[PDB]
Design a protein around this ligand. Structure first.
Ligand SMILES: Nc1ncnc2c1ncn2[C@@H]1O[C@H](COP(=O)(O)OP(=O)(O)OP(=O)(O)O)[C@@H](O)[C@H]1O
Ligand SMILES: [Ca+2]
Ligand SMILES: [Ca+2]
Ligand SMILES: [Ca+2]
Ligand SMILES: [Ca+2]
Ligand SMILES: [Ca+2]
Length: 901
DNA sequence: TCGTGGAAGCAGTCCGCG
DNA sequence: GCGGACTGCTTTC
């Protein structure tokens, strides 16, 4: 096999590298890597190295890395550019792996671990590490085993061994329901004392040294805790054995308000699953507890126990250990679904970076672009300092608030990346400027043509047309990967809908799910077999299709994010190729494209309808348009349609055969006007939306910018078995809105769009009547809580104190003098509830950590004093009043003359 | 919330508005 | 009560 790196570090003048050799063995080597950097030289001097602008460079070979670093400083002192890759380990990987890396995940040791620490005096601070570590479960991907290190004797209790037999039993038999599929993979080791536990853990770690290290909050909790605990007991030299090169560094992580410490383990790549999840999942959750996320992702019930976690070991050590094991497995289950480790390895090896650098799109792109340019003997520019400056972004049309019955949407495929490719926007392709007219003059095609030589953006920039820039070239490669995976995602999605249809008529039989590849549209033969399957087999096939869809979503959406991040990186001052001329060239061209095509679509439709000045485009945001299709439906007449699916077919065909060709002609003209390098503005139909045929549903509504709801029958070619709501911006989509309120508001919207005013009124009346029965957590608002200290004046709210912060201060007064009461953590999320006048908490609201029950100390009082009237008014009635007034609809029946009978 | 970008909505504070 | 200026938070692209 081809060799591939596992990890790489610079330690002084050595590169330390762990790698898989040509026989598939893990190896480690220290290399006295001599880096090269570059300086501009005279033309007369012959060379093969040129900067991205075509100016010649001399290569300077250094005796070691420290000499290279010192040279960069002196070049700054002198006032001259020091060119080349200044992150020497990236240069080392470029030299050592000068080919497309093919990696084999089965040879990469992925470790997933979790620790337990009993603490009677509140949260066990990792920087102090003053309490024993009393359990570690460490899953190893190469062994496929859960290694359980269990402390039997501690100053907080002596306990009996954990029983695998009880662990396996049902909760109803008094067991822990440790899943049967992992029971045989558990390797259980009990210890008489903590010192032996940890010494054995370190020996184990040396034998089975993680390459990728993950878990839940491992970077902020488990890793620093283990390191500092070992450090306190044995000294630093022993704690440093967690690094395969015996080197660690406390790293200070700064943000706007405050900072925290982590431990950098040289030669390990830590990918904390909480951070993977936050970056790659595209959710926003009200809580990031593993229990909460596990329930959300896997539909597994929360891990239940009696009493506080600080007494769980002593009261029920059996359950304590089982829950530590299950916690590790839950993360593995999330990853089996979401495949974020796979994504990380893919992108890391593609860019040739430390795998943990996948968290930084700037680092990722710097490496991709460096490797690309190096292949052509080109030399990257030095990074420079820039002051942060604001710059303009997208255009958003102000919609007229209203119901909108029939709607077709269209938007550009990978808009900003396509603009980069079309215009040829790159650091080295800048050809000059032209005199800009107002944007409006380009939109209406009255401005002078910018150039007859170069490719232009309406911000005044011109670009070469003779050759692609490195940014277009590399962005295209990832775009093509993205497109492949999106294809698999949409096929799986379409396949899912076939199974849902078939589930209407399941067969009374015993059979098996079909062995198929859900990434490809089902053949006719597969469709026929599906129609004969049992509900059991169908449901298993649906689950598998949906997992295939998720896998495709992860792969495509994060490649989309990476390429969009490159457009964004051009406006980040730390990026080697930062240039507001290029970032603004993209955004300003986008504003033009949207408004240009709005004008073309209105012109086209006014022509087919034989009108003038009518607005068919009702909305658009960045790269999208929403087109009213009422007149198109009315030209055929609603009476002529057999069913909903018939007019959906008709609109689909109209979009594909009339609108899209008009749109494409419109954009081809714009390409020629701007003299661009290649026409790549592809604006495909997204959604077909409307009410069910013959219903009194309104189909859709907008309340304002970034706030609308649509009843969609077809999305990017997926014809749904049941209509799906596309809701953007409304309270149903916000993590701050109470869970039960999201649900009720969504049902109000479904009724408005599908059934009509009367249905909406029936549901409102019932929700208003019953909502006081809802569980307090389900009707709590949610908010992130920053700057708690700034607004804390002797335990009471200071000037301008935010409502949620006030709630936290109320909570803190109510639990004062309790070391064991859950503390609200700066920067994390809280549930918030309003309190009625004259309550014992002495204020109008209270807040507590999200994803948790409020401590029993005060729960009963909170329940008694909860202000249901305020909660209803604020979170449900106010937003619903906004929806219905926009839609010209009443949520309460107005009186009429018929009342007099 | 360490980690690409800008646009823009709503809640709530403070306080004006005769 | 409603809005503007401002902060805080959140979402949509
Ligand atoms: N997370 C982001 N970071 C930077 N720019 C973004 C981000 N999300 C969207 N944009 C910008 O807005 C444009 C339009 O967004 P949109 O969500 O339609 O994605 P897209 O790139 O056009 O991909 P698709 O092909 O899925 O429509 C993007 O091309 C860019
Ligand atoms: Ca735990
Ligand atoms: Ca798009
Ligand atoms: Ca059937
Ligand atoms: Ca869009
Ligand atoms: Ca599309």
């Amino acid at each position: 096999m081809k060799e591939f790196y596992l990890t790489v570090e610079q330690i002084g003048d050595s590169i330390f590298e762990r790698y898989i050799d040509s026989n598939g063995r893990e190896r480690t080597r220290e290399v006295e890597y001599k880096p090269s950097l570059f300086a501009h030289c005279p033309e007369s001097q012959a060379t093969k190295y040129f900067d991205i602008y075509g100016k010649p460079c001399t290569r300077k070979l250094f005796a070691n890395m420290r000499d290279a670093s010192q040279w960069i400083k002196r070049m700054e002192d002198i006032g001259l550019e020091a060119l080349g890759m200044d992150d020497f380990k990236l240069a080392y990987l470029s030299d050592t792996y000068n080919y497309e890396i093919k990696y084999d995940h089965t040879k990469i040791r992925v470790a997933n671990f979790d620790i337990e620490v009993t603490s009677p005096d509140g949260f066990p601070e990792p920087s102090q590490a003053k309490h024993p570590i009393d359990a570690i479960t460490h899953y190893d991907s190469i062994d496929d085993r859960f290694y359980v290190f269990d402390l039997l004797n501690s100053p907080y209790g002596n306990v009996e061994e954990w029983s695998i037999e009880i662990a396996a039993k049902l909760q109803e038999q008094g067991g822990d329901e440790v899943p049967s599929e992992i029971i045989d993979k558990i390797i259980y080791m009990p210890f008489d004392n903590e010192k032996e536990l940890l010494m054995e853990y370190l020996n184990f770690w040396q034998q089975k040294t993680p390459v990728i290290l993950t878990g839940w909050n491992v970077e902020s909790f488990a890793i620093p805790y283990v390191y500092n605990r070992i450090k306190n007991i044995f000294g630093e030299s022993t704690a440093k054995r967690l690094s395969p090169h015996r080197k660690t560094r406390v790293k200070v992580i700064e943000n706007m308000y405050g900072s925290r410490e982590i431990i950098t383990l040289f030669g390990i790549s830590v990918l904390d699953y909480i951070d993977l999840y936050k970056k790659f999942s595209f959710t926003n959750q009200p809580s990031y507890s593993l229990d909460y996320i596990s329930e959300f992702e896997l539909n597994v019930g929360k891990l239940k126990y009696d009493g506080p976690i600080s007494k769980l070991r002593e009261s029920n050590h059996q359950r304590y250990i089982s829950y530590n094991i299950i916690a590790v497995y839950r993360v593995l289950q999330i990853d089996a679904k979401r495949q974020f480790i796979n994504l990380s390895l893919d992108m890391g090896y593609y860019a040739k970076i430390q795998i943990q650098s996948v968290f930084s799109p700037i680092k990722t792109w710097d490496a991709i672009i460096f490797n690309s340019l190096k292949e052509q003997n080109k030399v990257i520019p030095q990074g420079r300092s820039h002051p942060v400056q604001p710059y303009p972004g997208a255009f958003v049309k102000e919609p007229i608030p209203n119901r909108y019955k029939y709607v077709m949407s269209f938007d550009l495929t990978s808009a900003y990346p396509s603009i980069i490719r079309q215009v040829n926007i790159s650091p080295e392709t800048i050809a000059g400027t032209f005199k800009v007219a107002p944007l409006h003059d380009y939109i209406n095609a009255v401005a002078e043509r910018p150039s007859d030589v170069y490719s232009c953006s309406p911000n005044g920039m011109m670009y070469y047309k003779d050759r692609d820039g490195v940014v277009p070239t590399e962005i295209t490669k990832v775009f093509n990967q993205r497109k492949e995976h999106k294809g698999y995602m949409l096929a799986a999605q379409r396949n899912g809908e076939i199974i849902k249809e078939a589930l209407h008529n399941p067969n009374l039989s015993v059979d098996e799910p079909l062995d198929v590849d859900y990434r490809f549209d089902f053949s006719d033969e597969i469709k026929e077999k599906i129609k004969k399957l049992s509900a059991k087999s169908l449901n298993e096939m649906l689950f598998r299709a949906q997992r295939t869809e998720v896998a495709g979503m992860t792969a495509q959406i994060n490649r989309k994010a990476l390429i969009n991040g490159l457009a964004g990186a051009l406006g980040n001052v730390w990026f080697r190729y930062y240039d507001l001329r290029n970032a603004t060239a993209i955004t300003t061209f986008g504003q033009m494209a949207l408004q240009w095509i709005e004008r073309k679509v209105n012109e086209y439709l006014n022509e087919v309808c034989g009108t003038e000045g009518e607005a068919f485009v009702l909305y658009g945001d960045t790269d999208s348009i929403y087109v009213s299709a009422d007149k198109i439906i009315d030209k055929v007449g609603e009476s002529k349609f057999r069913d909903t699916n018939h007019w959906v077919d008709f609109l689909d065909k109209f979009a594909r055969e009339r609108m899209e060709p008009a749109i494409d002609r419109g954009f081809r003209e714009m390409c020629e006007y701007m003299n661009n390098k290649q026409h790549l503005m592809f604006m495909d139909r997204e959604a077909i939306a409307g009410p069910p045929l013959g219903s009194k549903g309104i189909g859709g509504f907008w309340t304002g910018k970034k706030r609308y709801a649509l009843n969609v029958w077809d999305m990017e070619g997926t014809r749904y078995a049941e209509p799906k709501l596309k809701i953007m911006g409304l309270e149903t989509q916000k993590s701050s809105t109470p869970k039960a309120v999201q649900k009720a508001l969504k049902e109000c919207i479904r009724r408005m769009l599908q059934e009509g005013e009367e249905s909406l009124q029936e549901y409102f009346k019932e929700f208003e009547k019953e909502f006081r029965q809802l569980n307090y957590i389900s009707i709590a608002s949610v908010s992130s809580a920053n700057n708690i200290a700034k607004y804390d004046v002797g335990g009471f709210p200071g000037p301008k104190c935010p409502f949620h912060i006030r709630g936290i201060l109320t909570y803190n007064r109510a639990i004062k003098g309790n070391i064991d009461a859950p503390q609200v953590v700066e920067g994390e999320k809280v549930y918030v509830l309003p309190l009625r006048e004259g309550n014992p908490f002495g204020d109008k609201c209270i807040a507590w950590p999200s994803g948790t029950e409020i401590t029993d100390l005060i729960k009963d009082d909170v329940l008694h004093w909860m202000d249901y009237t305020v909660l209803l008014e604020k979170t449900f009635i106010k937003p619903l009043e906004g929806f219905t007034s926009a839609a010209k609809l009443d949520y309460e029946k107005k009186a009429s003359l018929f009342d007099m009978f």
